[PDB]
Amino acid sequence: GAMNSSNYAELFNNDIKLFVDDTNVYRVTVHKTFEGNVATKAINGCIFTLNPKTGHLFLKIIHTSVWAGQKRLSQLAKWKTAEEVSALVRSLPKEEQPKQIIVTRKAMLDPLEVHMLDFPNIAIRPTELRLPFSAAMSIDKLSDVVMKATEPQMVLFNIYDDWLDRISSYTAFSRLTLLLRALKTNEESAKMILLSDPTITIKSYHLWPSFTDEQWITIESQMRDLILTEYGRKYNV
Amino acid sequence: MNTVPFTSAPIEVTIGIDQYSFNVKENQPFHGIKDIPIGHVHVIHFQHADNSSMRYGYWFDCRMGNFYIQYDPKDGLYKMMEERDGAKFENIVHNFKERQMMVSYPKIDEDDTWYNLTEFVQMDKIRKIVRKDENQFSYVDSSMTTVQENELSDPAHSLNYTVINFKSREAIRPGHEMEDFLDKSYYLNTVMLQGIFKNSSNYFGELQFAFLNAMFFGNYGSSLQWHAMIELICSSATVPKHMLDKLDEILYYQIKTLPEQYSDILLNERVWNICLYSSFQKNSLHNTEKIMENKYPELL
């Protein structure tokens, strides 16, 4: 069934699972036409498919050509996502195929279920968690490869860099979701926090800076700051 | 006009014969039902006064044999039987008619209700849904489950309706996932009509039989089947014009006949709102939409 706070450690057990987030698949800018009407212009997007235990990210880039001449694009986008996830599963060796796929939005349940009919033993699950994966396009290297794509493309990343050498996957996922929640709530400030110190760099083969254990504690504190200070400004506390 | 005699009525019971019902008291001198119209299937059904649990009954066609009812005190129910001795039967019936011990099928001459509810229903197809090949008539009751229900437990006592499942490989062509899920025409016209049912008459017959079992017996799996068969047509963009027109007439008479106070359990809000207001055929069921809006506006 649905995934929530009560069954959160299940993410880090040894059953292979993937999160699928479709938020950034169909992206547009809205603008005025010469006649003063409104139109949309699509820009490149991506499917965010993540193994939360290993950090492996399968970033399928969605090039704007896939929308040419199509109608009802927001609906098509969900089916295209499901097609691409199904294609990815079929491409993996049997022993790497997931046992469960968790979709971050419930509107992906039926499209994915239909595309995976051939895989009756893979569970398709929703979640009650409000995960911040939409903010993936605030990670500079991910945004860069999506916007530069001139054709459909899959790019593989480890979204945890080398963190699992030093911390568990529960802690790594917690750090990731904190970083992404901060980038989603106030991107400019979150990015200021992460790069303010010119002496801490991002390795060529990494996504995030090379913080020591102690610096991650400072960084993580600065991000909380931000999320709790917003909550109050948004509601009252 | 044919007759279904009763040996006796040892237990107090409400007896249905099609849309009509009457009460028989314990050991009242009741010996059956006469003047049953030839040319239609019929259902004779029972609800005991002591235990309203278990509505049960029999589908039959008087052209296929001479049938009677006899209470069984061991199994505790009124059983249909076939009498093979034609002269014994004619003689039994004539004596009961002479003593005026039989009630009369009270068909108003203007009234086409039963025809309209059973237009496509044939005994031979009933007997393939309800398997008991040694009898010419078919027993159904409130509790019998469907083949599809047993997949999600006694097979000999099941309703073998055609399984419809919108998220199934039968329903969804590889490479047409979005197309086939959002427009069910492939599944309706190729898989079901051409492949399984062969024609729309057999499709409508099963739809009508499912409705009647839902209504007369409270059979939940039959209600599920009726709604699935409606939804499959309404969710198809491409349906023959004659099928839509006939479906509207079929549903109109079903909604007209439904007891007002059973609508809450016999009608699925989601299916009907989708069919009448969101689906491809939202504008093709004028008679059904008009009666639904005037009789059951709450459901919508």
Ligand SMILES: N=C(COc1ccccc1)NO
């Ligand atoms: N029309 C009726 C009652 O019809 C009958 C039939 C046979 C004997 C008595 C009454 N209820 O719907």
